[PDB]
Structures are given as C-alpha cells and as structure tokens.
Amino acid sequence: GTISLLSTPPVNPPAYSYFYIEFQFLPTNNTPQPYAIFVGPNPNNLTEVAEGYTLSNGTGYARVPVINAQTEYVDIVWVNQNYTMFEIFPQIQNATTTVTLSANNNQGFSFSLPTWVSWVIGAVLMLIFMGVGWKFMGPAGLAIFGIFGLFIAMFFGLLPSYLMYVILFIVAIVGARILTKQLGG
Amino acid sequence: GTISLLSTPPVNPPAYSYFYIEFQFLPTNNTPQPYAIFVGPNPNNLTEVAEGYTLSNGTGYARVPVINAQTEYVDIVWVNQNYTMFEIFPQIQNATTTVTLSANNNQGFSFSLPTWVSWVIGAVLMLIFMGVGWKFMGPAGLAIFGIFGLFIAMFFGLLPSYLMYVILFIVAIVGARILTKQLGG
Amino acid sequence: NVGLLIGLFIFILVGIVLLPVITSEVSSLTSGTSPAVTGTNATLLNLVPLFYILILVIVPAVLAYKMYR
Amino acid sequence: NVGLLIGLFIFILVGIVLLPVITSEVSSLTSGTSPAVTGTNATLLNLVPLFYILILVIVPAVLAYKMYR
Amino acid sequence: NVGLLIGLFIFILVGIVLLPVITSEVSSLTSGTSPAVTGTNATLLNLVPLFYILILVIVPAVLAYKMYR
Amino acid sequence: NVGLLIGLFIFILVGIVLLPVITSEVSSLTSGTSPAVTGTNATLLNLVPLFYILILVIVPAVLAYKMYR
Amino acid sequence: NVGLLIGLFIFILVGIVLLPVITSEVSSLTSGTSPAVTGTNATLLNLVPLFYILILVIVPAVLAYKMYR
Amino acid sequence: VSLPPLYVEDAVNAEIQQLWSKSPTGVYAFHEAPSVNNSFWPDDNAKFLESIAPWWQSYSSYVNSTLQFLQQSDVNGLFIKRFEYPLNPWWEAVWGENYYEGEIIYALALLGKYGNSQALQMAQQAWLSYYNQLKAYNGATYTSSLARFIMATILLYNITGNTQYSNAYTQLANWLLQYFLDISAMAGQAMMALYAVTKNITYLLDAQLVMNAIYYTYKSELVSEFGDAIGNNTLASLAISRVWQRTSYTYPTSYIYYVARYGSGLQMNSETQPWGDVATQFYVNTWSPSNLDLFWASLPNNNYITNQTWNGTALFIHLYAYQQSQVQLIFLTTTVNFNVLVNGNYTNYEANHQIMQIAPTLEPGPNTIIIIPNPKNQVSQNTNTLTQNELMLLGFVIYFVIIMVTYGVSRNKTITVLSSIVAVAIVYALALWPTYMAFILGAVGFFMLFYSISRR
C-alpha cells in the first residue's frame, strides 16, 4: 500500500523539541498495523523511535524528536510494506551553553564552561550525591538523591536534562514490581 | 529443491573479518525454512555457524566469518534438503603479532612476543585484574574488571579481541535475568 | 538538649534581626550609579545575603545532626 | 556566648565594609597600563576578591559550628 | 579569637600591597631584549608571583580551619 | 584530613608547573638530529612524561585509599 | 615538607641529565669491535638503561608515597 | 500535505537563522538588515509570507508570529512602514503609509489561497480599505503597489468568488493604463495577470511594450518575475542569472541572497531575500521540467544563462559567458544516473540522491549543455603532547584510580560499581577512550551495578 502525511511536519523546529505527525495508511483493510519512525542525520544512519500500532481507521498519530544536526531525515516505515522519508532542518544549538544565575534582579552571574569540564564536574557531583543518598536512605536513596543531584545540576550548567528520564524510567519499573508484589498471590 | 547465491561471496577477504551472503531457495512454498552455514578448513572439518530461518520470500541474508586458514569451505545447508559449498582463500595472518605503541608522535615503542608468552602474560594479568575486581566490587566486579583487563590487554599485544564477546555474552544473560526478576510475579 | 535549642533559637532570631542591615550594606556597595565592585564581584555581593541565609539554616542542621549521633 | 555572636557579626560587617579597599587595590593593579602584567596575573588578581568572599562567608559558618559545640 | 580574625584582613592588605613590588622586580629581571633569565628560568621566575598569590589566597583557608580546630 | 588535601593540592600544582621543563628536557635528549639515545631508549624517554603524569595521578589515589581505610 | 618535593624533583631532573653519560658508556661498551662480547652481554647492557629508567620513574612515586605518610 | 522543496527551505532557513529577532511590541518578526538591527518592516514580513505561502503549514509558528505582527501593525486597514528601535546613543513607530502595501495585500491573498482563513479575511479587509482609499483620490499611489493590488484582486476573485473584485480590477486596469526598472517589471507582471484573467489584447500590447523597453539585486528579481510572467526565456533567464551571480549557497542549509556584490555592504537585505526566493521558485515551477529543477548557478564574472528548454526528454541550457572560466550548476532531482554534455566533450558530474552538480569549463562563445536523464548507454560517471595510545593508557590509569579511591572511601560494592559507571562517563568526557570501549564498559557497569544491588 501507500502511506501519506495528514499533517505537515514543521520545518526548522527548535533544537531538542518534539512535533506530532499525522500519518495515514492506504489499503489497510480493517486492522491495526505496525510502524516505526527512523529519525537521524543522513538516510544511512537512522535511529529508530516511536513504535506503536495505528488505529483501525488507518491513521496513526506519533511524536518525532529533533536531533542536534543541521539535516535530519525522518522516515515513517510500515514495517514490511512501503515507507517514506522527509528532510527537516532543525536549528543547531551551540555545544557550549552559557547559564545566567539571577541574583537581586539586575545582577546576574553569567558563566559558561567547556562541555568536558562541565560533564566531569556533573559526574563527580552525581557520585557525591548518590553516595550520600546511599549512606542516608538506602538503595531507594540512590534513586532519590540521584534525582535531587541531577536537578541541582540542571539548575547549574551541567549534565543535560534527558538523563533524568533514565532514572525516571528505572524507578518506574521498580515501582511496578512492588505494586505487583502487593496484588497477586 | 535447489539453493542459489544472489550475491557473490568476496574471495580473498581479510583474516578475521565477516561478509554477507544472499542465499535464496527454490520450491519453498510459502514458509520460512531452516539453514546452517558450515564454515571450515577442508570439507571434512566444518564448524557450524549462522543458524536462522529464511524469509517467506525464500531468500535469507546471513553473515559468514573467515577462519585463519589458506583454504576455507563455506557450505550453506537447508537442513534436510539440498546443500552447496564454495571455497574461499582468505589472507593468512601471521601467528606473531607486532604492536607499536606511539608516544610523542614520531617515536614508537615496537615489540612482538611469541604467542605462548603473550598468552600466559595475558592470562596472569586477567587473574590479577579479576581478583582485584572481586575484592573491590564483587561478583559483578568479576565481569566489569574482566572487561577492563581484557581491554588493557587488547591495548598491548595480548589475548585476542573475541574473548571479550565471551564475557559480553555472559553479562547479557545475567542482565536479562534481573530484568525478568523486576517484571513478573 | 534544651540549652542547645535555646541557643539556636536566639542565634536564628539574631540572624533574622540583622539580615536587613547586611542587605542594605550590600545594596550600598553594589546598587547605585557608583560602581564600587565590578560585575562578577557585584553579582557575588548580591549572592552573599542568600549565602548568609543558607548558613543560618545549615548551622542548626549540622549541629543537631552531630549532637543526636 | 553572645560575645562570639557579636564577634562573627562584626567580622562579616567589617569584611563587607573593607571589601571596597580590596577592589580598589585590585583595580589599580590590573587596570590599563598594568604593572602586574596582563594574563594569568590578572586572572589571579580578579580571583582574590572571589576567594576572599568565599572565606568571608564560610568562616562564620565554621566558627558558629565550633563555638556551639 | 577576633584578633586573629582582623589580622587576617591585615595580612590580606599587606600582601596585596606587597605584591606590586615583587612583580615589578620579577618583570625587570625577565624583561628586556637580552635579559639574563633565558627562557626556562624566565618561566619559573614568572611562576614565582603566581605561587606567591596562590599562598596569599590559601593562607586564609588554613587560618580559618585552624580556628575551627 | 584538611592538611593532607592541602599537601596533595600543592604537590599536584608543583607537578603541573614543572611538567613542561621535564618535557623540554626529554625533547632535547631525544628530539633533534643528535641521537643522544637509541630508538628503544628514545621511545622510553618519550614515555617518561606520561609516566610522570601517571605518578601525579596515582600518588594521591593511593594516599587517600590508605588514609580513609 | 617542600624540601623533599625539591629533593625528588632534583632527583628526576639530574637523572635525565646524567642519562646521556649512561648511554655513552653502554654504546662504547657494546658497539662495533665490542670488548664486552656480543650476545647475552649486549642484551643485558641495553637492558641497564631500561631498568634505570624504570627505577628513575618508580622511586619518586614510592618516595612521595612514604613522605606524605 | 505538500512539502517545501530544497531551495525554498534553504533560503527560508538561512533568513530565519540570521534575520529573526524581537519586535518592540513583543511578537517575533524579521528586521531589515543584519547591520541596522532596529527597523522592522511589515512589508518585509509580507514578502516572506509571499515567499513561503505555497508551503505555509511547514513554517506554521513563524507565519503565525508574522501574522500577529501584521495584525498589531495595522491601524484600520492600512499598514505602517516601520517599527523602529530608538537609537540610545508605548509605541515607537513611524505612522506613514507603507510602500508596496499592495504587495502586502498580494501576500495575504496568496496565503489565503492555500489555507489560513485568518490571512484570507485580513486580505479581504485590507483590500476593501485600500480600494476605498484609492477611489478617494484616483491613481495618486505607488504604481508597483497598484500592480500588486491588481494581482491580489485577481487572486481574491479566484478564491473567494465575490463578483465586485471583477469590476474593481477592470477599473484598476484603467489606472495601470493611466501610468524605473522595478516598477516597469511589476507593471508588466500585472499586465500579464490581467491578460491571463480577461484575455484582452491591449494588456498584451502594453506587456510586450514593457518587454521591448528592457546593482540593487531586488530589481533583477522583479525583472525575472516579470519575464517569467511574459514567457520570454532570454529575459527571464538573464535576470535570474544576474540574481544568481551574487548569492552564497552551500548544499545542506544556507542560501543567502546578497544585496550588492560590488557594494561593501553585501549582507542579507531582507527586502531582497524573500524576493529572490520567489524569483527562484517561480523560475523553477514555470520553466524547469517536472524532475530536473535548476535553482542555483555560480557564474563567475558576467556569465548569464540565456535559454532552458525541455526538448523531448532532454534538457538544453544555452548559456553565454566571458573569458572562459568555469560555472557551477546545481539541479534539484531524484534520479541518480544521467549524462551531461558540455558542447560535445561528455564531461563528468556530481550527483547526490537529491542534488546533482556540474562544474564544467565553458568556452567564451555561446555554449549548450545537454542533460539527458535516465539515458541509454550512459557515458558520464558519478565521481566527485600525548597521542591516542598514550591517552588510552592514561584513561586506564584514571579508571583504576577512581575505582580504587571510591572503594577506599566507601566499603560498599554498589557504590564501587556506580563509581565505575561514572568513571566510564568521566573518561569519555575527556575523550581519553574511543566510544566503543567506553560504551561497552558503561553498559557492563550498568548491568553489574543492578546485579550487585540485587545480590545484597
């Protein structure tokens, strides 16, 4: 069959944002169908995102992120049948990030560090905070104080935000486990 | 039925590389079929690789390694029905390996040891590193410091690279276990 | 101990009472047309009042944490 | 132990009062036609007030921590 | 107690007013078209004021921790 | 301990400060037309600066590892 | 303990300075028309500078480890 | 559902990346020049809207921003000229009527044709306002703005269906018959539009009179648009080549139209960059064939393309040049293999899966380039201190150092494997290890840390 886009994908989006795509399939008889969105720089190097099954109508609504590259190819794949890709030119974000801590309104402490020293500083800070959390609370203290330390790093110019989600993933599974352990036999 | 090669296998490949083969079957009605690639020196002594099932189209894409022998027979087997083999002459790699550690650009410390002394040195180094890892971290420390010590051996002229995959296999299973232990009841 | 609590209470009250004079002095040094301190230094002085508040809120904390043991 | 309370409070007030003198000396040493030589010397000279502020804000915390012990 | 605290500021002021002469001396010893300092001894001599100001900055921390203990 | 940290800091700073002279001496011995040292020896001298860096980064490590106990 | 710092630094600098003399002696002993006899003697003679460098780079590490203890 | 092509995307991307800032009132909009940084021309944003109208849904956010800017920059139905930032060495904006505001009406109408009902209502309201203002005087307005008004009225009648527009343009036609290079170009463009809508000979007579009548790049862009409307390959190609002589183009992102090559201030004047985009896209959509789309050409000196004809299944480019030299043509295409022919020497070419590029050497006289797509017996080809080992040793040493230090500080093993993880991270931060070993050890440390937490 053929696949089409019911919504125009926004060209030139911000660096690390996301956008919705409205992709609808053709000769889908009545059943949900698989799809995958390979997004990446250059058609050869694609990173897969957005698994899921489209609705019985044949239209699926998906979320696509934007990489930190000048040219990004986004390829909707039916997983077996026809596929299609389109190119997007997201705004590039500079490697060095400058952070301004505002104190007493007008005065602002502005500073920017090279990415390597910022990464190592954030890593050592995460070590210290996770060790303190382990000493204080325990194995759950590891996760709690990791979240706290990564928050305090995000407040400064340090480790990026998405690292949080990693921890936020790992907690979730653990939570599920305990809930299950309190439900069945 | 009959089996054929849709892609020509590269004669004279490097010593320890791999190549893809594109093997397609004949009178396969509509179902996936098993296959196995017996690769080895002389048709009598074949080592089996590349299990899997071909696509419903009747074409399977497989990876074949190259042994360190002058003549290598690669035999695609349908596992029951017809089979076929072809011969390849890979480039032989010398038993003694010479390693050059580059320091301050032009100057390079070059050395090469006999395979037996290199193997025993790497083995003793692996002992020391694995024991230190067990003392430091624990049973997972065994695997982590084994990986580290085998990396530091690969940096020198020591134990070959593929040993890593062994450890990289054994970790994987363990990881799977813990993931399962955090999912079900 | 009751004595430690009383001392901490009076210390916190003293900190609250003479916070405004410290803030006014910092503003006099930094705020205004006269640049007594350069940008980085001026931002540092604007940070000092909060560092002072942090000291007032951490000193009883470490005191209790070490005392209870 | 209110005498030490007054001691640290006078310490911090006097430090903020005298800080303009330190800034004046640093600026005179590192401004145009610099006799301290521009470069790492200027960076260290600008760092002196920063670490001086760090000391001025850390030493009251540690003094209060020790005196109530 | 407070005497050494104010002596810390006195020492900081005396150091910041004693640096301009030692830096002038080292610059005079290292400057010129053909100075008798070569290139490596020149780097060490230029580093000497850097270690001096590093000591000037570190000493307040040592004094603060000595007062702590 | 604070004293151990201060000593380690000054030792690391000294190592950083007089690394370049060691590197220059090694280059003078090895680099250049004059072969003061043969190939294997010359490679060894080119390795010495990194061995020196390794010493600078391992000595505080073993010091802390033994001290904390 | 800066005296020992200078001691080890002078040790390593003097070792690298005097190493050319060792190389000259070894080369004179093991070059053509060798009076030290070619064979295992030549291998050991070439090994002397290598283990000398090993000592010259290991003994500062152990001396620094012991002195800060 | 349509997607913008590469040339339009490149031009708009460059303009947005370079010429996007904050208006005095709050809505983000385009300023005029890189150096001026103060003036915000609503006419300029109208030009950008004209450039981006056919693929409006792609740049939804920017179009919404500039539409809000236009909404707050209109008094009743007529737009103001500038929103100036005061020079330091509550509304701050000169209230004079904006020149080429008929261009604004045309841009809003073009936006309305493809959607954006807000833009269509805006175009209708401003149409009524300016038509009443013109009927108040007669023909005492800017002439190019009047021509763009006739174009906007034609579009509005095309997409709205209101009959009054018809009568209006007829009267407006008389006004244009009642009356520089750029104004002549717009007058001829409106002549061609009027002929296309009403098929009256006198409009063609005036248009060919302007044709026979024929620095500051934009004038060349209006000339190229006029020639595209007429259908003269020679004039339109010459004008678009003059446009291309002073543009900066790289393959992936940038497509910048300079305002003057000889002038010191080349820069990117926002008055011309959308005009250049419109000229390029008009030329491609009209004269180029379905697949092989020529949008950029680096012609050194005064070389100019004369003709571009799709003869049967082969594209012919007739080009004139001076003092030999090499020109470089870039074609938007999908096919990979096709053969180019400069004169008769069978030169080679470069072709990605979306862009092909030829860089041949051309003779002083007129020369023909024949591009045959999907050809039989293809001839042209498709050709176009420390060191790493020392750093790896230092990384191994650092890794062991931090692991041992962590184990010494805290006797727990879980903290030790977590420190191994963070040590992999640190040694990757300094780029001491290759990403392969770093990632392998990081994953191993992750799984071993979770195993150690499980085993406690």
Coordinates of N, CA and C in Angstrom, one line a residue, chain B residues 10-113:
Chain B
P10 N 32.9 -12.6 -1.4 CA 34.2 -12.0 -1.7 C 35.3 -12.9 -1.5
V11 N 36.0 -13.3 -2.6 CA 37.2 -14.1 -2.4 C 38.3 -13.3 -1.9
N12 N 39.3 -13.9 -1.2 CA 40.4 -13.2 -0.5 C 39.9 -12.1 0.4
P13 N 39.2 -12.4 1.5 CA 38.9 -11.4 2.4 C 40.0 -11.3 3.5
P14 N 39.9 -10.2 4.4 CA 40.9 -10.2 5.5 C 40.8 -11.4 6.4
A15 N 41.7 -11.4 7.3 CA 41.9 -12.6 8.1 C 40.7 -13.0 9.0
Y16 N 40.2 -12.0 9.8 CA 39.2 -12.3 10.8 C 38.0 -11.4 10.6
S17 N 37.7 -11.1 9.4 CA 36.5 -10.2 9.1 C 35.3 -11.1 8.9
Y18 N 34.2 -10.5 8.3 CA 33.0 -11.2 8.0 C 32.4 -10.6 6.7
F19 N 31.6 -11.4 6.1 CA 30.9 -11.0 4.8 C 29.5 -11.5 4.8
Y20 N 28.7 -10.7 4.1 CA 27.3 -11.1 4.0 C 27.1 -12.0 2.7
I21 N 26.2 -13.0 2.9 CA 25.8 -13.9 1.7 C 24.3 -13.8 1.6
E22 N 23.9 -13.9 0.3 CA 22.5 -13.6 0.0 C 22.0 -14.9 -0.7
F23 N 21.5 -15.8 0.1 CA 21.2 -17.2 -0.4 C 19.7 -17.4 -0.5
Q24 N 19.2 -17.8 -1.7 CA 17.8 -17.9 -2.0 C 17.5 -19.3 -2.3
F25 N 16.3 -19.8 -1.8 CA 15.9 -21.2 -2.0 C 14.8 -21.3 -3.1
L26 N 14.7 -22.5 -3.6 CA 13.8 -22.8 -4.8 C 12.8 -23.8 -4.3
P27 N 11.6 -24.0 -5.0 CA 10.4 -24.6 -4.4 C 10.4 -24.6 -2.9
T28 N 10.4 -23.4 -2.3 CA 9.9 -23.1 -1.0 C 8.5 -22.6 -1.2
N29 N 7.5 -23.3 -0.6 CA 6.1 -23.0 -1.0 C 5.7 -21.6 -0.5
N30 N 5.6 -21.4 0.8 CA 5.3 -20.1 1.4 C 5.9 -19.9 2.8
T31 N 6.7 -20.9 3.3 CA 7.0 -20.9 4.7 C 8.5 -20.6 4.9
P32 N 8.9 -20.0 6.0 CA 10.3 -19.9 6.4 C 10.9 -21.3 6.5
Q33 N 12.2 -21.4 6.2 CA 12.9 -22.7 6.2 C 14.2 -22.5 7.0
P34 N 14.7 -23.6 7.6 CA 16.0 -23.5 8.4 C 17.2 -23.5 7.4
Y35 N 18.3 -23.1 8.0 CA 19.6 -23.1 7.3 C 20.7 -23.1 8.3
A36 N 21.9 -23.6 7.8 CA 23.1 -23.5 8.6 C 24.3 -23.4 7.7
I37 N 25.3 -22.6 8.1 CA 26.5 -22.4 7.3 C 27.6 -23.0 8.0
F38 N 28.0 -24.2 7.4 CA 29.2 -24.9 7.9 C 30.5 -24.3 7.2
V39 N 31.3 -23.6 8.0 CA 32.5 -22.9 7.5 C 33.7 -23.6 8.2
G40 N 34.7 -24.0 7.4 CA 35.9 -24.6 8.0 C 36.9 -25.0 7.0
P41 N 38.1 -25.3 7.4 CA 39.2 -25.8 6.5 C 38.9 -27.2 6.1
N42 N 38.9 -27.5 4.8 CA 38.7 -28.8 4.2 C 37.2 -29.2 4.4
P43 N 36.6 -29.8 3.4 CA 35.1 -30.1 3.5 C 34.8 -31.1 4.7
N44 N 35.8 -31.9 5.1 CA 35.5 -32.8 6.2 C 35.4 -32.1 7.6
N45 N 36.2 -31.1 7.9 CA 36.2 -30.5 9.2 C 35.5 -29.1 9.0
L46 N 34.2 -29.1 9.2 CA 33.4 -27.9 9.2 C 32.9 -27.5 10.5
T47 N 32.9 -26.2 10.9 CA 32.4 -25.7 12.1 C 31.1 -24.9 11.7
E48 N 30.0 -25.2 12.4 CA 28.7 -24.7 12.1 C 28.5 -23.3 12.6
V49 N 28.0 -22.4 11.8 CA 27.6 -21.0 12.2 C 26.3 -20.7 11.6
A50 N 25.8 -19.5 12.0 CA 24.7 -18.8 11.3 C 23.4 -19.7 11.2
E51 N 22.9 -20.0 12.4 CA 21.5 -20.6 12.4 C 20.5 -19.5 12.1
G52 N 19.3 -19.9 11.7 CA 18.3 -18.9 11.4 C 17.3 -19.5 10.4
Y53 N 16.2 -18.8 10.2 CA 15.2 -19.1 9.2 C 15.1 -18.1 8.1
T54 N 15.1 -18.5 6.9 CA 15.0 -17.6 5.8 C 13.6 -17.0 5.7
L55 N 13.5 -15.9 5.0 CA 12.2 -15.2 4.9 C 11.2 -16.0 4.1
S56 N 9.9 -15.7 4.1 CA 8.9 -16.3 3.4 C 9.1 -16.2 1.9
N57 N 9.8 -15.1 1.5 CA 10.2 -15.0 0.0 C 11.1 -16.1 -0.4
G58 N 11.8 -16.8 0.5 CA 12.7 -17.8 0.2 C 14.2 -17.4 0.1
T59 N 14.5 -16.1 0.5 CA 15.8 -15.5 0.5 C 16.2 -15.2 1.9
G60 N 17.4 -15.7 2.3 CA 17.9 -15.4 3.6 C 19.3 -14.7 3.5
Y61 N 19.5 -13.7 4.3 CA 20.7 -12.9 4.4 C 21.5 -13.3 5.6
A62 N 22.7 -13.8 5.4 CA 23.5 -14.3 6.6 C 24.9 -13.7 6.6
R63 N 25.5 -13.9 7.7 CA 26.9 -13.4 8.0 C 27.8 -14.6 8.1
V64 N 28.9 -14.6 7.4 CA 29.9 -15.7 7.4 C 31.2 -15.1 7.8
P65 N 31.9 -15.7 8.8 CA 33.2 -15.3 9.1 C 34.3 -16.0 8.3
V66 N 35.5 -15.6 8.4 CA 36.6 -16.2 7.7 C 37.6 -16.7 8.8
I67 N 38.0 -18.0 8.6 CA 39.0 -18.6 9.5 C 40.4 -18.2 9.1
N68 N 41.4 -18.5 10.0 CA 42.8 -18.2 9.8 C 43.5 -19.4 9.1
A69 N 42.9 -19.8 7.9 CA 43.5 -20.9 7.1 C 43.5 -20.5 5.6
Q70 N 44.4 -21.1 4.9 CA 44.6 -20.7 3.5 C 43.3 -21.0 2.7
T71 N 42.7 -22.2 2.9 CA 41.5 -22.6 2.2 C 40.4 -22.8 3.2
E72 N 39.3 -22.2 2.9 CA 38.1 -22.3 3.7 C 36.9 -22.6 2.8
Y73 N 36.2 -23.7 3.2 CA 35.0 -24.1 2.6 C 33.8 -23.6 3.4
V74 N 32.9 -22.9 2.7 CA 31.6 -22.4 3.3 C 30.5 -23.1 2.6
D75 N 29.7 -23.8 3.4 CA 28.6 -24.7 2.9 C 27.3 -24.3 3.5
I76 N 26.4 -23.7 2.7 CA 25.0 -23.4 3.0 C 24.2 -24.7 3.0
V77 N 23.5 -25.0 4.1 CA 22.8 -26.3 4.2 C 21.3 -25.9 4.5
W78 N 20.4 -26.5 3.8 CA 19.0 -26.3 4.0 C 18.5 -27.1 5.2
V79 N 19.3 -27.9 5.8 CA 18.9 -28.8 7.0 C 17.8 -29.6 6.5
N80 N 18.1 -30.7 5.7 CA 17.3 -31.8 5.3 C 17.5 -32.0 3.8
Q81 N 17.2 -30.9 3.0 CA 17.2 -30.9 1.5 C 18.6 -30.5 1.0
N82 N 18.7 -30.2 -0.2 CA 20.0 -29.9 -0.9 C 20.8 -28.9 -0.2
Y83 N 22.1 -28.9 -0.5 CA 23.1 -28.0 0.1 C 24.2 -27.6 -1.0
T84 N 24.9 -26.6 -0.7 CA 26.0 -26.3 -1.6 C 27.1 -25.6 -0.9
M85 N 28.4 -25.8 -1.4 CA 29.5 -25.2 -0.7 C 30.4 -24.5 -1.8
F86 N 31.1 -23.5 -1.4 CA 32.1 -22.8 -2.2 C 33.4 -22.6 -1.4
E87 N 34.5 -22.5 -2.1 CA 35.8 -22.3 -1.5 C 36.3 -20.8 -1.6
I88 N 36.9 -20.4 -0.5 CA 37.4 -19.0 -0.4 C 38.9 -19.1 0.1
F89 N 39.7 -18.2 -0.4 CA 41.1 -18.2 0.0 C 41.4 -16.9 0.8
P90 N 41.1 -16.9 2.1 CA 41.4 -15.7 2.9 C 42.9 -15.5 3.1
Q91 N 43.2 -14.2 3.3 CA 44.6 -13.9 3.6 C 45.0 -14.4 5.0
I92 N 46.1 -15.1 5.0 CA 46.6 -15.6 6.3 C 47.3 -14.5 7.1
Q93 N 47.0 -14.5 8.4 CA 47.6 -13.6 9.3 C 48.7 -14.3 10.1
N94 N 49.9 -13.7 10.2 CA 51.0 -14.3 10.8 C 50.7 -14.5 12.3
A95 N 51.2 -15.7 12.8 CA 51.0 -16.0 14.2 C 51.5 -15.0 15.2
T96 N 52.7 -14.5 14.9 CA 53.3 -13.5 15.7 C 52.8 -12.1 15.3
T97 N 52.3 -11.4 16.3 CA 51.8 -10.0 16.1 C 52.7 -9.0 16.7
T98 N 53.0 -8.0 15.9 CA 53.9 -6.9 16.4 C 53.1 -5.7 16.6
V99 N 53.2 -5.1 17.8 CA 52.4 -4.0 18.3 C 53.3 -2.8 18.5
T100 N 52.8 -1.6 18.0 CA 53.6 -0.3 18.1 C 52.8 0.6 18.9
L101 N 53.3 1.0 20.1 CA 52.8 2.0 21.0 C 53.4 3.3 20.6
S102 N 52.6 4.2 20.1 CA 53.1 5.5 19.6 C 53.2 6.5 20.8
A103 N 54.3 7.1 21.1 CA 54.5 8.1 22.1 C 55.2 9.3 21.5
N104 N 54.7 10.5 21.8 CA 55.3 11.7 21.2 C 55.5 11.7 19.7
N105 N 54.4 11.2 19.0 CA 54.3 11.2 17.6 C 55.4 10.3 17.0
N106 N 56.5 10.8 16.5 CA 57.4 10.0 15.7 C 57.9 8.8 16.4
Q107 N 58.3 8.9 17.7 CA 58.9 7.8 18.4 C 57.8 6.7 18.7
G108 N 58.1 5.5 18.4 CA 57.2 4.4 18.7 C 57.9 3.2 19.3
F109 N 57.4 2.7 20.4 CA 57.9 1.5 21.0 C 57.2 0.3 20.3
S110 N 58.0 -0.4 19.6 CA 57.5 -1.5 18.8 C 58.1 -2.8 19.4
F111 N 57.2 -3.8 19.7 CA 57.6 -5.1 20.2 C 56.6 -6.2 19.8
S112 N 57.2 -7.4 19.8 CA 56.4 -8.6 19.4 C 56.9 -9.7 20.2
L113 N 56.0 -10.5 20.8 CA 56.3 -11.6 21.7 C 55.8 -12.9 21.1

